[PDB]
Each structure stands twice: as structure tokens, then as C-alpha cells.
């Protein structure tokens, strides 16, 4: 038989992992809601509260190097991360700033995984409006969608447990 | 009427190769159809079912690192892959998320080949609509196109047999 | 006079850091206002006047290699930078030059951080019009925004203090 | 379609060089016409028929790794290439697949030159319509333009003779 | 109306440097005007006529590898370049070729600097029309703008003098 064909969606136990969340501070009310959702979902999957490390940077452009150095600091302290969730909220304005920051930041986070040698979850919102970002953090008045921060927390746990440096 | 996918240049015999399929879970019904098509075409070319290994990740952005680590795990187990097919279905929504994920994921999969030292087949659908994705997986009500997963399985066998690490 | 106003996130003491500002010279009135705002904000955070080093390049495309060699020069002199702020102003014209320079410069500055081994703040304005650029340097007739040079100065201090080479 | 460009700055003698042509098979009638024109132009510049090596891959996305491994096999066989011409034809469809494959393939072929340590000629057509592609291979009904494969053969000989690994 | 080509922020003594100019041959009347302007300005800054080295390639896509190998050739000859100005003229046509060549060539030239270990001036015009390209080479009927080749010559001298390999 084909190995893994039809294997059901499993539950991941995050009890032994350490997760870093590093967030930008622009659009702070949205950021905070995304972070809280990631935290709650990881705690629901077993991640200990003392094993969830928070760090901040000024803007989304600072996420890649901030994440690199956050990983470095945690390893040097003897509390290395197994996975990290950089979180930022970018909202289109009148210039092309949104596009150039979003593009360079997204590629940099993707390409950073090889350098920090761990999964880096994509927690950057790249919205055309603030209303879109509120909805994607589960805090729009209409509660039209759900908090994507929860999905990022779940992905952090799965990626660490199945593919982390210590997984095999 | 014209002329897309070309006829395979020859009948590739995939009997000695091992292929990994690693797929995201967004748009799961479409994903499953693409995966089945890839498996069916590879089996028709002689790849043994025991040498087809399936792995999964949450979303398309996790495909590049997941593929890197899936390759590592298979090699560490003494069952190295000769070729891998990362499969993901991205459908344009309201924000620029589709574009940023599609762009960084496509470039990362292309650039991953030198790192995993094997061919990585491009199995990402980057569609504007769900109907377009359905049609490209061969599951639209009208069956207007065909299952592109089959083409990806054929490409995996050809790339592994002609250019894989063990080909020469 | 420490009047304050922008986002919490701790108060960073930049008294021990050395910051380089390297700026392009096209759109010089805008550039000069941006630079002056960055200097003023860093001075308000304790960065000493003799530890703010200024260098210039002709255009924004020269920022990446200019910054690489400015970092080299400062280290060879025994006055290494802890963080650098490349500043340039790109304004859309009639051709696609704006887009090609903006895109390659932004990615190069982001990817330069690993090479110079320090944070590189994104001080590149990528505006569709001159008025947009003026507004973002706090010098438009309407004073419709604020000088973004100040934000860059603040980010330079924070990134150096929290994540610079000498921070831990 | 109004075409510029010049003839070498000389008549290059390609009698001592070995050229690889590696083509995708999507849009095969157009591909064949392009390949033929490159061959004819190279033969007219003195490249021996025994020193023109043809290889194929399924689609344009397979060109970069296909080229990398084709160079490797030729070198391993003691018949190393001095230059290679990857040829593919991409025609916009309904989704963004055309854009994502074109973008990642073009960058990958450009960046591959350092890795294969030889010139890699850009023989990808990135057309909006089939007509446009037919015209650029010299086979549209009206013969409006000319076969661009010829220009690619000419550029392969010039780059090999002037800048190939063995040129100096 | 004949006058000094001096500019107050361009006062650099180029007497000790060697500059390479490597140009594409597509749109040759415009190319020649740009090259001429760069030579004229560098001569006005003291660069000696025997220290300005010219090389050519077929199209703008060949500029990155042509420049890499031109640098190698000059160093092997014991006449190493201190800075190089790749010049090419791209004019939008009916397909996406203009965009794919422009984008990959611009990124490759920017990233080539670390590899050739010298400044690489951005001398590529990426115009929508021939008239725009003519104007930017100072040869439109109207003489609406000025020859941008002059600015590139000035930047080449400044970058070599201030940041070249032998500057410090
Ligand atoms: O086009 P406009 O009107 O100027 C709107 C700007 C949208 C992008 C805003 C923007 C945003 O929406 N979100 C985040 O996180 N940062 C942004 N800019 C700050 C940068 O990340 C870096 O901190 C700074 O550049 C120094 O490195
Ligand atoms: O613009 P909208 O309306 O919000 C629609 C979004 C379309 C893109 C959706 C999306 C999709 O269509 N397909 C897949 O596979 N992933 C997507 N996002 C999940 C990410 O891949 C990562 O898992 C997550 O970011 C953590 O790393
Ligand atoms: O499209 P148009 O009308 O020609 C307008 C041009 C807008 C971009 C202008 C432009 C601008 O607005 N700002 C800066 O900093 N540089 C620019 N061009 C100079 C380049 O950076 C390099 O110095 C030079 O290329 C040599 O390396
Ligand atoms: O947007 P639509 O309607 O689906 C049209 C698609 C146009 C692009 C077609 C396409 C085309 O026009 N030409 C080439 O060479 N390959 C294409 N796709 C195949 C890929 O290159 C890889 O073989 C496959 O991805 C596995 O790696
Ligand atoms: O879209 P259309 O109508 O076909 C117009 C084409 C505009 C781009 C033209 C084009 C142009 O305007 N200028 C330059 O320098 N090269 C071009 N194409 C040649 C390439 O640089 C490479 O030499 C060749 O690809 C082999 O490597």
C-alpha cells in the first residue's frame, strides 16, 4: 500500500516544545489578538506557558533579523526555540511601501528557516484594509471569519513535532 | 485547440525509484484528487506502491521546509527519496496573502532543489477561483480539463530516472 | 525635551551604540529632512553625537553595496557600527525604473543584514509622487503625516540594543 | 513586431565549442521550431553537429534543475558543455500559474550560471497568446517577425567564445 | 552651449581607477549615446582613457554573467577593474519578455557585487517606449532630459573612490 495514504489528520502533543512568538508593534490591537489566539491554541495542544517566549520588534520589516537574533539569544541562554512565529500586520497605504515591505519580509522569513534551522510560521497579515485585518484576527464587529493566530499556533506545534530539529 | 502538455518523450520505467508526495491541507478535496492522480500515473509507470511515501503540512507556505525535513527523515531512515512532489492549492481571496504566499513558496521550492539535491516537481495550484482549481484536479462538474496531478507524477518519474542523484 | 507619543515598547537607551546613516542624494531636500529626524530621535534616546556617522551615495541603487563597504570601513577604522540606516527616496516616474530599483534595493538591504551581521533599518521611501515623499519626511505643505526618519532612528536604537552583535 | 539588436561585434567562430540545448515539451510545435533555428544559426557559426547536444524535460519549471543535471552528466561523460540553451514556451492561461512559473524559472536560470559555471542563454518565451509565441518562433501564418531561436544560437556562440570557462 | 560637466556632490578624483563598461547591443543607437556620456563624464573626473575598458554582449540578459567573466578576464590580465558599468536598453514589447528580463537582470546585477567584489553601477534602461529611452540617453529630438550615461559615469568614479576594493 502507499505509505500515509488516507492517514487521518492527527493531534499534535506540544508538551515538550518551546515556541517563540516575535511580533511587530504597528497595528497593535490586531497584533495582540493574533498573539493571544496563537498562545491559546498552543496551550490547548499541550505547550507549557513557560515554554512560550514572547519578543517584539518595531515593524514587520524587522521580523526577519529580529527572529534570527531572537533564536540566537534563546540558544545562548540554554532555552532554544523549536519553532518560531513572527507576527506582523501590514496594511496597504498610498505608496508602494506595503508591497516592498511585504514582499521582502515574506521571502526573508521563508528563506530564514534554513539559517535558524527550524520552522518559521508565516504570521504576517498583508491586507488592503484594516477591516480585513480585524476580521482575520477575529475582532471585526461582524465576527465574519475567525482568529488566524489560532491556526498559526496549531501550525507551529505540528511543524515542531513532525519536523523540528529534535523530532528525529 | 492548442497544444499544451507534450507527450512523454519515452516510456520511463519508475520501478527502482522512491517518490515522496508532501501536501498541504487547505482545499483538501482538491488536494486529494491531485494526489490520487499523481499516484495513479506513477504506478502506471512502474513505481511500486511501497515506494510512494505521503507526508502532509498545514498550508502551502509550510511546503518548502516540510519538504526539506521530509527528505532528511527519509534519508535518515535509510529510505531516501529520489524525487519529491510538494502539492498545495492556493486560491485568491480578498487580501494579498495569495500573492505573497504563492510567490515565496514557488521561489523556495525551485531553490530547494540544490539543497535537497533532487528534483522537486511544481505541484502548486495558484488559482483565482475554486472552479479553476477543481477543473485542474479533474473534478469540476463538467470535467473541462484533466487532473494535473497525473502530469506531476509523470514529471517526477522522468526527472528522477533521467536526472536523479542515482541516474548517473 | 522628551515629549513622547509613539507606540510604547520600552524606552531604549542608545548611549553605548554607534549608528551609521548612509543616504542617497537624489531628492535631496526630502533626504535631508529624513536624516535630520533620524538624528534628532536618536539623540533623544541617548546616542552620542560623535557616535552618529554619516555617509552618502549617489542613488538608492548604491545603498546596498555602499552600506556593505561603509560597515567594512568603520570596522577597519576601529569604530564599528552597531546598526545602520540606509536612506533613499525613490519617486515613480514614467518608466519602470522606479519599480526595478525599488524591488532590487529593498531585497538587497533585507538580505544584507546577514552579511554585515547587524540590523539594517529600512529607510527607503518608495513613493508614487513627490508629495507623498514630502509628507513622509514631515515637510509637505499640509503636514499631513510626520517625519518617518524619526521612526527609523527609534528602530535603529531598539534593534541595536536588543539584537545587536554586542547585545548578548 | 519591431525588433532591434545587433550582430556580434564580430563573426564568432564556434568550431571549438560544445553546446547543450535542453527543451521543455509543453507547446511542442513551437519548441521544435525554436530549437531548429538555434541549431541552424550555431551550425552557420561553425559549431559542429556532433558538438550540439539535445536533452528534454516535461515543462519549463524543470529547466533549471534539468540544466544543472544535464551539465553534470555531460561533464561526467568527458563531454562538458561550454554553454547551454534552456528553451521553454509559456503561454498565459486563466490562472497565475504562467506568472509564477515564468518568474521563478527566469530567476533560477539567471542564477544557475554561477553554479554550472558557464553562460545559460535565456530561451524562454513568456507570451500572452499562442499567436505571439508562433510569431517569435517564425511560424505564425503571416511570418510577421523571425525565429528567436536563431538569436539564442548566436548568443550561445558569442558567450562561449568570449566568456566561456575555456576562453581565457 | 558647451560647459563644464562638474557637479558639487560629484567631485571625486578618478585618476587612479580602472573602469569597465560592458554593454548590450540591442537598441544600439541608444546604447552608444549612453556609453559615450559615461566615458565623457569619467574623463572629466580624471579617469584616463587607457583605464576605461569596453566589452559587449548580445542582450541585456547576458550582462550579469558577461560582467562576472569580464571582471575575471581583466584580473587575469593584471588590469583588474575597480568598478564596472553594465549598460543595456530594454523597451517593452507585446509579451512579458521585457518584465522577466528586466527583473532577473536587475536583481542579478545587484547581487553580483558581492561576487565580483566591486561596485556594479545600474546602467539598464527599462522603458515603456523608444522615445523614453531616446530621451534618457539625451538623443530625443526635443532634448527633453539629459544623458543618464553621464550620471552612471559619475557614480562609477564615486563608488570606486569611496568604496572600491582599494579605497581602504
Ligand atoms: O504607503 P504608506 O502610506 O506610507 C503605508 C505604509 C504601509 C507599510 C506600513 C507598515 C505596516 O503596515 N506594518 C508594519 O509592521 N510596518 C510597516 N512599516 C514599518 C517597517 O516595517 C519598518 O519598521 C521601518 O521601515 C524601518 O525598518
Ligand atoms: O486573502 P484572504 O481572503 O485572507 C485568502 C487567503 C488565501 C491564501 C490561503 C491559503 C491557501 O489558499 N492555500 C494554502 O495552502 N495556504 C494558505 N494560507 C495558509 C499558509 O500557507 C500558512 O499555513 C500560514 O500562513 C502559517 O504559516
Ligand atoms: O522612470 P523615469 O521617468 O526615468 C524616473 C526614474 C525613477 C528612479 C529614480 C531614482 C530616484 O528617484 N531615487 C534614487 O535614489 N535613485 C534613482 N535613480 C538612480 C539609481 O539609484 C542609481 O543611482 C543609477 O541607476 C546608477 O546606478
Ligand atoms: O493558468 P492555466 O489555465 O492553468 C495555464 C497554465 C500555463 C502554464 C503552462 C505551462 C506552459 O505554458 N509551458 C510550460 O513549459 N510548462 C507549463 N506548466 C508545466 C510546468 O512547467 C511543470 O512541468 C509542472 O508544474 C510540474 O513541475
Ligand atoms: O515582448 P516582445 O514583443 O517580444 C519584446 C521583447 C523586449 C525585450 C527585448 C530585449 C531588449 O529590449 N533589450 C535587450 O537588451 N534584450 C532583449 N532581449 C534579448 C535578451 O536580452 C537575451 O539576449 C536573449 O533572451 C537570449 O539570452
Mutate to test the interface with D, among E27, E74, E93, E96 (most CBs of D within 10 A): E96
Q: In this structure, what C-alpha cell is assigned to residue C5? A: 507619543
Half-sphere exposure of D19 (CA within 13 A, CB side): 32
Asked if the Cβ–Cβ distance from B6 to D27 is below 8 Å, we say yes
Cα(A150)–Cα(A122) distance, integer angstroms: 12
Nearest CA among B51, B100, B56 for reference residue B79: B51
Other CB atoms within a 10 A radius of the CB of residue E75 amount to 13
**Measured distance CA(C110)–CA(C120) in Å, rounded:** 7
Euclidean distance between CA atoms D55 and B9, whole angstroms = 10
Q: Is D65 annotated as a binding residue?
A: no
- With contact defined as 3+ CB pairs under 8 Å, the chains touching C are A, E
What's the resolution in A?
1.9
- Alpha-carbon span D81 to D83, nearest angstrom: 6
Distance CA E164, CA E118 (A): 6
Residues ≥6 apart with Cβ < 8 Å to E63: E22, E24, E57, E86, E88, E105, E108, E109, E124
Contact criterion met (CB below 8 Å) for A23 and A37: no
Q: Which of A4, A103, A109 sits opposite B53 (nearest CB)?
A: A4
Inter-CA distances, E128 with C93, D131, E133, Å: 11, 22, 8
Facing residues of A54 across strands?
A21
If you ran DSSP here, which 8-state letter would residue A7 be given? P
Strand pairing partners for B86?
B22
C-alpha cell at E106: 536587475
What is the β-pairing status of strands A83-91 and A123-127? parallel
In angstroms, the Cα distances linking D94 to B106, B125, D30, D91, E114 are: 18, 12, 20, 10, 39
What is the C-alpha separation between D155 and E62, in angstroms, rounded? 9
Using the beta-carbon criterion (under 8 Å), do D4 and E91 form an inter-chain contact? Answer: yes
E16 burial type by CB count under 10 A (0-12 exposed, 13-18 middle, 19+ buried): middle
Closest Cα to residue A85, out of A131, A126, A46, A36?
Answer: A36
Q: Give the three cell numbers for residue D50.
A: 556532433
CB atoms within 10 A of CB B9: 13
d(CA C105, CA C96): 14
Neighbours of E42 (CB within 10 A): 28
Distance from the first to the final alpha carbon of chain B: 39
Helix axes of C148-163 and A63-76: crossing angle, nearest 10 degrees:
20
E42 membership: H or E segment, kind and range: helix E28-44
Pair B144, B135: CB distance under 8 Å = yes
Q: Mind spelling out the 3-state secondary structure of A99-165?
A: HHHHHHHHHHHHHHHHHHCCCECCEEEEECCHHHHHHHECCCCCCCCCEHHHHHHHHHHHHHHHHCC
Pairing of strands A19-23, A83-91: parallel
Start-to-end CA span in chain A (Å): 24
Neighbour tally for D130: CB within 10 Å: 18
d(CA B111, CA E21): 31
Task: Cite the beta strand spans of chain E per DSSP E.
Answer: 19-23, 52-56, 83-91, 123-127
Q: What are phi and psi of C99, to 5 degrees?
A: -60, -45
Nearest to D13 by CA among D163, D152, D157: D157
| Paired residues of C83 in beta bridges | C19
E95 labeled part of a ligand binding site: yes
Q: How many CB atoms lie within 10 A of CB C53?
A: 17
d(CA A66, CA A146): 28
User: Could you tell me the end-to-end alpha-carbon distance of chain E, in angstroms, rounded to an integer?
Assistant: 39
Annotate B66-77 with b (16+ C-beta within 10 A) or e (fewer): bbbbbbebbeee
* Positive/negative CA dihedral, D145, D147, D153, D154: negative
Domain definitions of chain A by residue range:
1-168
Residues 6+ apart with CB under 8 A from E83: E17, E19, E20, E118, E119, E120, E121, E156, E157, E159, E160, E164
Tell whether the torsion through CA atoms of C102, C105, C108 and C113 is positive or negative. negative
Measured between alpha carbons, how far is E91 from E102 in angstroms, rounded to an integer?
10
Give the strand order in the sheet containing E83-91. E52-56, E19-23, E83-91, E123-127
Residue A83 CA to chain centroid, in angstroms? 9
C98 lines ligand 3 (CB under 6 A): yes
- Please provide the distance, in angstroms rounded to a whole number, between the alpha carbons at the two ends of chain C: 31
Contact B89, B34 (CB under 8 A): yes
Would you give the distance in Å from CA D160 to the centre of its chain?
Answer: 13
Which residues of chain A neighbour C110 with C-beta distances below 8 Å?
61, 64, 104-105, 107-108
User: CA-to-CA distance for A167 and A163, rounded, in angstroms?
Assistant: 6
Of the partner residues D58, D100, D103, the one whose CB lies closest to the CB of residue B158: D58
Nearest to D95 among B6, B128, B168 (CB): B128
Residues of D in contact with E107 (CB under 8 A): 107, 110
Rounded Cα distance between E30 and A18, Å, is: 60
Written in H, E and C, the secondary structure of A106-118 is HHHHHHHHHHHCC
Ligand 4 mutation pick, D29, D92, D93, max ligand atoms within 8 A of CB: D93
- Cβ pair E12, E153 in contact under 8 A: no
Q: After which residues is chain B broken (C to N over 2.5 A)?
A: none
Q: Which ligand is closest to the CA of D57, given by its number?
A: 4
Residue numbers after which chain C breaks, C to N beyond 2.5 angstroms: none
Number of neighbouring beta carbons within 10 Å of residue A32: 16
**By CB neighbour count within 10 A (0-12 exposed, 13-18 middle, 19+ buried), where does C8 fall?**
exposed
**D124 in helix, strand or coil?**
strand
Enumerate the β-bridge partners of residue D20.
Answer: D53, D84
Q: What is the 3-state secondary structure (H, E, C) of chain B?
A: CCCCCCCCCCCCCCCCCCEEEEECCCCHHHHHHHHHHHHHHHHHCCCCHHHEEEEECCCHHHHHHHHHHHHHHHHHCCCCCCEEEEEEEEECCCCCHHHHHHHHHHHHHHHHHHHHCCCECCEEEEECCHHHHHHHECCCCCCCCCEHHHHHHHHHHHHHHHHCCCCC
Quick one: cell of A129? 484594509
* Joined grid coordinates for residue E156: 562609477
Burial (Cβ within 10 Å: 0-12, 13-18, ≥19) of residue E4: exposed
Beta pairing class for B52-56 and E52-56: unpaired
Q: CB of D118 within 8 A of CB of D167? A: no
- Which residue in D23, D13, D54 sits closest to D137, CA to CA? D23
Among B60, B119, B66, CA closest to D61: B119
> Which residues have any ligand 5 atom within 6 Å of their CB?
D 1, 121-122, 136, 152, 155; E 24, 26-27, 58-62, 88-91, 93-95, 97-98, 101
Give me the torsion for CA of B40, B44, B49, B55, rounded to 10°. Answer: -40
For E28, residues 6+ apart whose C-beta sits below 8 A from its C-beta are D4, D5, D6
- Give the CATH number of domain C1-168; options: 3.30.70.20, 3.40.50.300, 3.40.50.960, 3.40.50.80: 3.40.50.960
Alpha-carbon span C75 to C81, nearest angstrom: 7
- Residue A54, annotated ligand binder? no
- Cell numbers representing residue D104 in the block: 521563478
User: Kind of pairing, strands D123-127 and E123-127?
Assistant: unpaired
Q: Is the Cβ–Cβ distance between A90 and A124 less than 8 Å?
A: yes
Contact B6, B38 (CB under 8 A): no
Strand locations in C33-122, DSSP E?
Answer: 52-56, 83-91
Short-list E54, E45, E48, CA closest to E123: E54
Element (H, E) at C69: helix C63-76
Report how far ligand 1's centroid is from the alpha carbon of C168 (Å).
27
Nearest to D150 by CA among D129, D108, D121: D121
DSSP state of D60: G
How large is the greatest C-alpha to C-alpha distance in chain E, in angstroms?
Answer: 48
Instruction: Name the DSSP class of C109.
Output: H
Which own/partner contact pairs does A133-141 have at CB distance under 8 Å and 24+ positions apart? A133/A27, A133/A30, A133/A89, A133/A91, A134/A30, A136/B95, A137/A30, A137/A33, A137/A34, A137/A37, A137/A89, A138/A33, A138/A37, A139/A29, A139/A30, A139/A33
Q: How far is CA C27 from CA C84, C95, C124, E6, E10, in A?
A: 20, 18, 12, 19, 15
* Short-list B39, B56, B57, B61, CA closest to B48: B39
Identify whether the C-beta of residue D48 lies closer than 8 Å to the C-beta of residue D15: yes
Q: What sign for the dihedral angle of Cα D58, D106, C110, C116?
A: positive
- Asked if residues D57 and D22 have their Cβ atoms less than 8 Å apart, the reply is yes
- Mutate which of B59, B92, B100 for ligand 2 pocket (most atoms within 8 A of beta carbon): B59
Decide: B97 and B168 in contact? Cβ < 8 Å.
Answer: no
Amino acid at each position: 500500500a502507499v505509505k500515509g495514504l488516507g492517514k487521518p489528520d492527527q493531534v499534535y502533543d506540544g508538551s515538550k516544545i518551546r515556541v517563540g512568538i516575535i511580533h511587530a508593534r504597528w497595528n497593535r490591537v490586531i497584533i495582540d489578538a493574533l498573539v493571544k489566539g496563537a498562545i491559546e491554541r498552543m496551550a490547548s495542544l499541550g505547550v507549557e506557558e513557560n515554554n512560550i517566549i514572547i519578543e517584539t520588534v518595531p515593524g514587520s520589516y524587522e521580523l526577519p533579523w529580529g527572529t534570527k537574533r531572537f533564536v540566537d539569544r534563546q540558544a545562548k541562554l540554554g532555552k532554544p526555540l523549536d519553532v518560531v512565529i513572527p507576527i506582523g500586520v501590514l496594511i496597504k497605504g498610498s505608496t508602494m511601501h506595503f508591497e516592498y515591505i511585504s514582499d521582502s519580509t515574506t521571502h526573508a522569513l521563508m528563506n530564514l528557516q534554513e539559517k535558524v534551522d527550524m520552522p518559521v510560521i508565516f504570521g504576517l497579515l498583508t491586507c488592503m484594509t484594516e477591516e480585513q485585518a480585524l476580521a482575520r484576527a477575529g475582532i471585526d464587529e461582524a465576527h465574519s471569519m475567525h482568529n488566524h493566530g489560532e491556526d498559526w499556533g496549531a501550525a507551529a506545534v505540528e511543524m515542531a513535532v513532525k519536523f523540528g530539529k529534535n523530532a528525529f
